């Protein structure tokens, strides 16, 4: 029982437990009427009005394991409806930010604590955040570019939030989990939701592509595997609900994760196609059959590699011809017509394969000329009109192991007109590293030699994207959305 409150005369009791239901007891006849699906657990509840017009309560959203993300609520009590809902952005990070405690419950599971587990977990989390230099907090965040709306992919859900008006506009459940037909209590709390990992839009804006994985329940025969599902959603420019149009079960065979999704540029199919890249080497190109009404395969490239690498990337030229598939240690240049190596008839040392000293975390092309690669220790800017590296930069003290293999792409991004922006984060140490962090923001040019602009922010920065009116949006651990603009 997490929240309790009394009415004013003292005849009704309000009870606020884990199962997301707010229960009103008549005390005399011991009776109850209750509101059963409340978008999270009821941390706190009370009455407000001098007659009892409104019930105001505080919800947790207990699924968000990386960060506690509250939601205030004010209910009109006659209709039992929601006269007000108050919220901010709800990002899911990769690890628990500074000194967060999960709520208390009857057992110790992966959404809550016991009592003893609460105390010990508090101390252990603080000590681990002090000690380990593994720590990263990098959140996926997408942007609807024909409405400029931030899409924070929650676990098994999407919070559509805009930054102008600074308020949530939608919450949608994008997975067939156990998301709402129950309030999870103990071993339901042991179970968990299928997680959305990747979320992209086409450049046209009218197609959303979501990749999620789903985990089976524990202690069963088929608990070892996962199931990875791709989904394609549409909407018209007047509604606020995405209709599922195509569900693709198990891309690239059984239990094979698609560790990069890339939409298509405009010129190829009016930006109505996507590329899926595994951790093995396979690249698939899906597109929209329009005499049908669906998405299907239209070009495969499936090699069988006995080596798995968790960090891939890829990039696409603006014409729709050159594709740079950067697998670990090696970038391959492919023609889209053949999905094979672009072998030069002239052979002017424009070799189809590049081998880079560290593992690739990012490939980008700022124009049809300059290719930027962010490698596991360093950063290399190369030209394509002459096959030689232009510029180099050392990042090995800055990013040693403080990011997982595959998150520097969401760290560093580029404007398609002026330049790119670097992001470096270090935590301020005193004599041992302390809690607080410090993140510097550097803006290079297309040649990457001259730094266009240097700035510094105090709190850790988890994600930089570029706003399509040539500026840059960045999120923060404490969710303060900022902009680097003209």
């Amino acid at each position: 029982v997490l929240s309790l409150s009394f009415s004013h005369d003292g005849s009704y009791l309000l009870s606020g437990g884990w199962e997301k239901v707010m229960s009103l007891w008549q005390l005399e006849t011991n009776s109850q009427q209750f509101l059963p699906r409340l978008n999270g657990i009821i941390i706190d509840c009370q009455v407000l009005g001098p007659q009892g017009n409104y019930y105001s309560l505080i919800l947790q959203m207990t699924e968000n394991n990386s960060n506690s993300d509250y939601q205030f609520l004010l209910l009109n009590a006659s209709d039992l409806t929601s006269k007000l809902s108050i919220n901010g952005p709800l990002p899911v990070f990769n690890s628990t930010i500074k000194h967060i405690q999960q709520p208390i419950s009857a057992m110790n599971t992966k959404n809550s604590n016991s009592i003893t587990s609460l105390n010990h977990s508090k101390k252990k989390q603080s000590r681990k955040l002090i000690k380990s230099r593994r720590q990263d907090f990098t959140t996926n965040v997408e942007i609807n570019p024909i409405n400029k709306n931030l899409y924070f992919p929650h676990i098994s859900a999407v919070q559509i939030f805009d930054f102008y008006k600074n308020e949530q506009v939608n919450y949608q459940y994008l997975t067939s989990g156990v998301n709402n037909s129950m309030g999870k209590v103990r071993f339901e709390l042991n179970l968990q939701d299928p997680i959305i990992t990747d979320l992209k839009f086409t450049k046209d804006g009218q197609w959303m592509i979501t990749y999620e994985i789903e985990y089976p329940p524990n202690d069963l025969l088929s608990s070892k595997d996962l199931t990875h599902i791709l989904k394609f959603w549409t909407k018209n420019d007047n509604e606020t609900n995405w209709n599922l149009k195509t569900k693709v079960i198990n891309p690239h065979g059984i239990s094979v994760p698609i560790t990069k999704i890339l939409p298509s540029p405009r010129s190829v199919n009016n930006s109505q196609g996507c590329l899926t890249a595994d951790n093995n080497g396979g690249l698939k190109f899906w597109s929209f059959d329009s005499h049908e009404s669906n998405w299907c395969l239209k070009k495969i490239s499936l090699p069988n590699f006995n080596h798995f690498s968790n960090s891939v990337s890829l990039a696409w030229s603006q014409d729709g011809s050159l594709i740079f598939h950067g697998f670990d240690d090696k970038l391959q240049i492919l023609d889209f017509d053949t999905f094979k190596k672009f072998e030069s008839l002239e052979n002017t040392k424009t070799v189809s394969e590049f081998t880079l000293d560290s593992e690739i975390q990012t490939v980008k092309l700022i124009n049809d000329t300059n290719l930027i690669v962010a490698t596991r220790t360093t950063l290399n800017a190369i030209n394509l009109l002459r096959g030689q590296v232009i510029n180099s930069f050392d990042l090995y003290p800055f990013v040693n192991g403080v990011y997982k293999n595959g998150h520097m792409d969401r760290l560093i991004t580029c404007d398609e007109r002026t330049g790119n922006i670097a992001l470096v984060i270090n935590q301020q140490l005193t004599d041992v590293p302390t809690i607080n962090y410090k993140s510097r923001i550097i803006i290079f040019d297309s040649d990457l030699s001259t730094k266009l602009g240097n700035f510094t922010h105090h709190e850790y920065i988890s994600w930089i994207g570029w706003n399509y009116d040539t500026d840059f949006i960045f999120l923060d651990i404490e969710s303060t959305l900022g902009v680097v603009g003209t």
Binding site: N39, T81, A157, Y173, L221, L244, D289, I300
Partner: protein, 475 residues
């Protein structure tokens, strides 16, 4: 209209209007130039407001009642400040005021002069052959306010200092209802029911002109120094005559006409507008007694105008907290699959006594029954011989037919498997010769993909099942 008697202030910022409410009249002041639920109720259910006036430093209004009294009503406090009484019990048929002197026409022709700043009745008054009267105005000769004008279908210019008529103009047929001094030499007069307005000249005693409206006249107002005239007509309208006293030209028509039409096509009636130097103030009733207003530029709108107001005719109840339909703004949309196309990622697409002659015939055609009979043939030597005798394009289409039949009827994948086995044995040359073998033999590849992926869990289940079976069989 439910608005019995209404009148603007000077300078056009607040209108008084007296209207009836469960058979008790209330007066109310509303502001216009940019609600007020204050009112004054007449406590008696019989006395009515007979005439109305605004008076200037503290603003007030003056209410000539039915009873025989003339109330003086402040606005800020809803309180009758002082109730003058003519020493009689009649109906004050008209009230008027200039400066501090106040003059009222009683029901029995008795003129009364009151003083405001003295709170007194100065003089009772009556003259000869002014026997029925219902309108009074006072000419602005300055602060010397002599030679007032009275009327009831015969306008008479009466002096005070000698108590006699000087000039008498021919009026109307019906009684007059509007009598307003336009300039220091002219005045306009309009009866009750006539569409005509007579512009008379005082000293000559003549009719300079007549102005003819389009329906029966109800309310008149004029600009500063005789430039324009707004007419509230009985149908609901507004008729400005631009420059009325200029240069047959005996009768003049209305220059500019204004109506008010809402979105739904209905016709909202205007009452009691007010004009000034290039600013026209129009009023109407939105709900049954609540007056709404508008300001508009009559020197710039065209000759015929229809104000377009947004009146809620057949509103759909857009609640602010509900959605457009059903849910509220705090819930969460469910995950509904619907008629989405569920596919896999292994669906390659968009990238001797034989029967060989009847098979090749069926597959040049496309015959379920004939192909079903040939497939119901069983003997493996006959199968080998038929596929040995067949043609490669026929073999490819045979492979597709066999694979789709397998994928539907998975029970039929023994004999159809030996069929596809012998086909891939024999005709392999054309198969290695055709380029896009995946796009050709799509469904075969997908069906074998499903089954070969199914295998390992079956191995595990058989392992555990055999363990339990031998456990209960050993003892």
């Amino acid at each position: 209209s439910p608005v019995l008697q209404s009148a603007y202030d000077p300078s056009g910022q607040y209108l008084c209007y007296v209207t009836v409410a469960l058979d008790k009249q209330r007066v109310g002041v509303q502001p216009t130039q940019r609600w007020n639920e204050n009112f004054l109720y007449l406590e008696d259910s019989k006395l009515k407001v007979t005439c109305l006036k605004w008076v200037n430093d503290t603003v007030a209004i003056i209410l000539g009642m039915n009873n025989g009294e003339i109330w003086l009503y402040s606005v800020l406090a809803n309180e009758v400040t002082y109730k003058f009484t003519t020493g009689n019990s009649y109906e004050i048929k008209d009230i008027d005021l200039m400066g501090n002197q106040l003059w009222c026409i009683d029901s029995s022709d008795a003129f009364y002069q009151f003083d405001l700043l003295q709170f007194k009745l100065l003089q009772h008054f009556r003259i000869n052959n002014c026997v029925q009267l219902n309108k009074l105005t006072i000419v602005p000769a300055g602060d010397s306010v002599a030679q007032l004008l009275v009327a009831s279908h015969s306008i008479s210019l009466i002096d005070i200092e000698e108590k006699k008529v000087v000039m008498t103009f021919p009026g109307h047929v019906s009684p007059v209802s509007t009598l307003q001094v336009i300039t220091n030499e002219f005045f306009i007069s309009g009866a009750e029911g006539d569409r005509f307005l007579n512009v008379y000249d005082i000293h000559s005693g003549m009719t300079k002109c007549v102005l003819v409206a389009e329906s029966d006249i109800k309310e008149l107002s004029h600009s500063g120094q005789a430039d324009s005239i707004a007419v509230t007509t009985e149908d609901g309208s507004l008729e400005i005559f631009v420059d009325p006293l200029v240069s047959g030209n005996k009768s003049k028509k209305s220059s500019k006409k204004i109506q008010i039409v809402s979105k739904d096509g209905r016709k909202v009636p205007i009452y009691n507008a007010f004009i000034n130097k290039d600013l026209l103030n129009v009023s109407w009733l939105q709900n049954a007694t609540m007056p709404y207003f508008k300001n508009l530029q009559w020197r710039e709108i065209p000759n015929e105008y229809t104000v377009e107001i947004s009146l809620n005719w057949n509103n759909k109840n857009k609640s602010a907290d509900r959605d457009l339909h059903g849910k509220d703004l705090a819930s969460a949309t469910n995950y509904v699959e619907g008629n989405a196309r569920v596919t896999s990622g292994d669906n390659f697409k968009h990238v001797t006594g034989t029967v060989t002659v009847i098979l090749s015939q069926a597959l040049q055609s496309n015959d379920h029954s004939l192909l079903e009979t040939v497939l119901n043939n069983r003997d493996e030597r006959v199968i080998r011989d038929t596929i040995f005798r067949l043609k490669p394009a026929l073999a490819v289409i045979l492979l597709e037919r066999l694979a789709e039949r397998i994928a539907r009827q998975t029970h039929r994948q023994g004999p159809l498997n030996v069929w596809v086995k012998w086909c891939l044995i024999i005709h392999g040359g054309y198969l290695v010769s055709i380029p896009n073998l995946m796009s050709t033999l799509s469904s075969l590849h997908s069906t074998l993909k499903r089954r070969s992926d199914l295998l390992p869990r079956l191995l595990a289940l058989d392992a555990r099942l055999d363990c339990t079976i031998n456990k209960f069989k050993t003892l």
